[PDB]
């Protein structure tokens, strides 16, 4: 069909040729990614003979805007600011990264181009010359302190990688390599730990979970940051930080950028800000219902051309039974205002002292988002007469929500109120009428949820356990 | 099967040339499809080249045997 249309295009070229196409490309030149992807596609064997290659590397720099100086055929250096690296300012060449060496030795010039882009973004700092060198030094001190704090947790408890990610000081931390900055993994959702029962080992993927990056970024305001490692003396349990001043008032703060903005509620902003004065969003922007933002984050994880047009009526299909969940945004909280929140991408912290507290609040907000997020789905359940056991989620207190469903055996509405008090310790209470059939034991539901994943799922277990009895 | 072998090789050559033109136009998943469909075709043509190698062994001796018998019979 279209393979015969590709044969038709070849016939058209013959009527016209490959040489003519090359001439047209040359004329366009006179007037990156795809190549490397399809190059691995080809790679039964790799390019052995490589006459120039230097010319392509010069071209890659030209497109980047970097400056290339080459000493001999073997060594070529791309130099800008302190971002100087050589394939054979204020610091020694740190490492022969296997990551960069492997990509260059194999036919992946595209991957090398991405790595340079990362290095350029890290050093897109407004400050230049001496101011930039000190600012980088501050980032190095923060990295050393965060690394030590992670080491202390491992010494105190020999926890497995999963425990460190879910409930540990800092988080699984990978030290910065080339352009990539330090990544602290705040949370690994139970459903996504399982892929199509993954055992993490020390080989935990960079993106196999929720990850946050620590970096220095320029700010309009002026702040004091440690310019030397501040954990000179460490109390054996937890950490002790020697007081500031050393430090200098650089016009920037340390940041905890999140790759995908996390929807966060107004209550969390107050709970977090209690610990840290630094204004998170400073200029008060927009603040609408949280449940809408949670749906957008979940729906946009996988992008499709047609907007779901859910009307907050998400439909879920499960191995046994069919369920419809109404998210009920706009339900009044005790204060009389619907849960309202704004996406947060960057959180700024001066020192790491308040960081353990800030992360614990974030873990709770992320966990609540994941349980409510598991329901959001692209289901076209239209005219569904059989099954269709529908249940709904009204926000009744910041950090609490109620899923309401008809009693599985009897007829009265029964509601499970779940509060995300902890990241791994949501506490749920079943509300059932005085005359009703014992629907479930709170512990059995917990065991099924922990062994498996998500909350659309929790409702199935509640229905199945009641029916089995 | 010689005519079929020639045609099979010709199909690979013309489609590869058109793919080069498409790559010049490009600079996504259509070129990814073009690459993986070309993969199957030229890998089967590499198996036909392995058969051409054995044609330069067994089939070559067989052809020589027929030619030698002709002259010997005469």
């Amino acid at each position: 069909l279209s393979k015969m249309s590709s044969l038709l295009e070849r016939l058209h070229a013959k009527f016209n040729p490959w040489s003519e196409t090359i001439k047209l490309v040359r004329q366009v030149m006179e007037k990156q990614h795809l190549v490397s992807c399809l190059e691995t596609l080809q790679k039964a064997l790799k390019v052995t003979s490589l006459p120039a290659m230097t010319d392509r590397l010069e071209s890659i720099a030209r497109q980047n805007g970097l400056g290339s100086h080459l000493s001999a055929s073997g060594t070529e250096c791309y130099i800008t600011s302190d971002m100087f690296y050589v394939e054979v300012h204020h610091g020694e060449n740190p490492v022969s990264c296997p990551e960069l060496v492997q990509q260059l030795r194999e036919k992946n010039f595209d991957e090398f181009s991405k790595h340079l882009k990362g290095l350029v973004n890290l050093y897109n700092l407004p400050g230049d010359n001496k101011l930039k060198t000190k600012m980088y030094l501050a980032l190095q001190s923060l990295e050393q302190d965060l690394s030590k704090m992670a080491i202390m947790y491992w010494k105190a408890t020999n926890a497995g990688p999963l425990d460190k990610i879910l409930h540990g000081s800092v988080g699984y931390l990978t030290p910065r390599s080339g352009g990539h900055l330090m990544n602290l993994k705040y949370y690994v959702s139970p459903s996504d730990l399982l892929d199509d029962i993954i055992l993490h080992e020390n080989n935990v993927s960079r993106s196999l979970g929720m990850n946050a990056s620590v970096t220095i970024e320029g700010t309009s305001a002026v702040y004091k940051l440690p310019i030397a490692p501040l954990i000179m003396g460490s109390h054996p349990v937890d950490n002790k930080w020697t007081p500031s001043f050393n430090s200098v008032d650089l016009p920037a703060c340390f940041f905890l950028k999140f790759p995908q903005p996390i929807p966060v509620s107004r209550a969390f902003v107050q709970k977090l800000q209690n610990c840290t004065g630094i204004p998170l969003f400073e200029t008060q922007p927009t603040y609408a219902p949280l449940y809408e933002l949670i749906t957008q984050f979940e729906l946009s994880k996988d992008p499709d051309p047609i907007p779901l047009n859910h009307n907050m009526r998400f439909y879920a299909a499960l191995p046994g039974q069919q369920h419809c969940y109404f998210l009920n945004k706009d339900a009044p909280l005790p204060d009389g205002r619907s849960l309202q929140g704004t996406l947060v991408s960057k959180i700024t912290f001066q020192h790491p002292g308040r960081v353990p507290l800030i992360l614990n609040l974030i873990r709770h907000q992320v966990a609540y988002n994941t349980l409510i997020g598991s329901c959001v789905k692209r289901t076209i359940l239209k005219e569904d007469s059989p099954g269709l056991l529908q249940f709904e989620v009204c926000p009744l207190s910041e950090s609490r929500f109620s899923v309401s469903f008809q009693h599985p055996v009897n007829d009265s509405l029964v509601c499970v109120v779940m509060d995300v008090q902890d990241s791994t310790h949501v506490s749920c209470k079943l509300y059932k009428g005085l005359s009703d059939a014992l629907i479930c034991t709170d512990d059995f539901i917990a065991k099924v949820v922990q062994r498996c994943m998500s909350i659309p799922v929790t409702m199935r277990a509640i229905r199945r356990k009641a029916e089995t009895i | 099967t010689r005519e079929r072998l020639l045609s099979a090789l010709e199909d690979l050559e013309v489609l590869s040339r058109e793919l080069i033109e498409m790559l010049a136009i490009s600079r996504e998943n259509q070129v990814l499809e073009l690459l993986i469909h070309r993969d199957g075709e030229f890998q089967e043509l590499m198996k036909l080249a392995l058969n051409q190698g054995k044609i330069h062994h067994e089939m070559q001796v067989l052809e020589k045997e027929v030619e030698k018998r002709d002259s010997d019979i005469q």
Partner: peptide, 29 residues
Amino acid sequence: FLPLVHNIIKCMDKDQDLNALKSKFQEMR
């Protein structure tokens, strides 16, 4: 054959039209 074409692909990435012409001569061979 294709191993020579793989060498031709390396030249095309490096630059090219001459390599495609070489592939046509290889088809004559």
